[PDB]
Design a protein around this ligand. Structure first.
Ligand code: SF4
Ligand code: SF4
Length: 81
């Protein structure tokens, strides 16, 4: 999963880009719910939130390091099949 750092400027741009609804507004920044963050695998070849973030404050979360398979499995759990 990814995380949003303290450098987030609360621009609102990443929330509508998440296919899994993993992003919401937090206390001082936007936040990723790691149980919904597939790093976009299954939907897109690259993270959509990273693509729109104006200040590059979306990074791998080292306390949720996931393989492509784990992420895929997560994608399948969220969307079904
Ligand atoms: S990487 Fe993809 S799944 Fe994770 S929060 Fe960003 S847009 Fe959502
Ligand atoms: S796109 Fe980047 S700066 Fe804007 S709300 Fe999301 S994480 Fe914060």
């Amino acid at each position: 999963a990814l995380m949003i750092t303290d450098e987030c400027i609360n621009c609102d741009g990443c929330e509508p880009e998440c296919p899994n609804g993993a992003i919401s507004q937090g206390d001082e920044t936007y936040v990723i719910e790691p149980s919904l963050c597939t790093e976009c695998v299954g939907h897109y070849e690259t993270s959509q939130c990273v693509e729109v973030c104006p200040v590059d404050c979306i990074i791998k979360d080292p306390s949720h390091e996931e393989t492509e398979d784990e992420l895929r499995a997560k994608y399948e759990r969220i969307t079904g099949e």
